[PDB]
């Protein structure tokens, strides 16, 4: 069976374009558009990989992965950043993240990186 | 004048193997150990040729890549692979790659390969 990626960005168009892309390259995807619709589906649909957006509403990118560390759920997260909103990756470490996309990107950089990471596990 | 190569590898052994060669072949040599001083110095000292590794600390290859792209810089550049870490070549080229090597490879390969990119240009 399909590796299942939840994906979580407030624009629109960026989900569209991450669902499209990911279920054409056989992954089941499912999505969420702030960080509270976020935590629930993370906890309740337990993804193979969490694609997060650092600014997010309601909670945010960190405050995501923190709450997921603090109920010691380990999921392979994916962060997204807006151009020039440079994100500590030290800080990104203690959160549980493992690979960081600068938006915009492009549908094989995605690709390239979803694989990379379900490989490392 | 000799050209100049920037070696990039977060193993230090590879480093040294790269600069060695390299310097006995007729190149000048400058390093890098994390994708933050690879670009650092890719911008400041305009290398004529860069060899990267595409797993790097701070900033992967990609990113350093895909940064140099944004920047309308245009650098040769050898990519590094590691064994069973196949890379999508295509995805390559819109980044800017120019060729490809795997580790482990031999003081000739990498000679060879340096070359041939520098005589395209
Ligand atoms: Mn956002
Ligand atoms: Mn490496
Ligand atoms: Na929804
Ligand atoms: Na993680
Ligand atoms: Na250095
Ligand atoms: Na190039």
Redesign the interface.
Same mark, same amino acid.
């Given at each position: 069976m399909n590796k299942k990626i939840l994906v979580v960005d407030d624009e629109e168009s960026i989900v569209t374009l991450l669902q499209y892309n990911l279920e054409r390259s056989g992954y089941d995807v499912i999505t969420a558009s702030d960080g509270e619709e976020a935590l629930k589906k993370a906890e309740t649909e337990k993804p193979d990989l969490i694609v997060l957006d650092v600014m997010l509403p309601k909670l945010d990118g960190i405050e995501v992965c923190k709450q997921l560390r603090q109920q010691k759920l380990m999921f392979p997260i994916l962060m997204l950043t807006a151009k020039d909103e440079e994100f500590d990756?030290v800080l990104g470490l203690e959160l549980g993240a493992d690979?960081?996309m600068?938006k915009p990107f492009?549908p @094989?950089?995605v690709?390239? @990186?979803v694989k990379?990471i379900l @490989?490392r596990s």
């Open positions: 990756k690979d960081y600068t492009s @094989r950089e690709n390239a @990186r990379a @490989r």
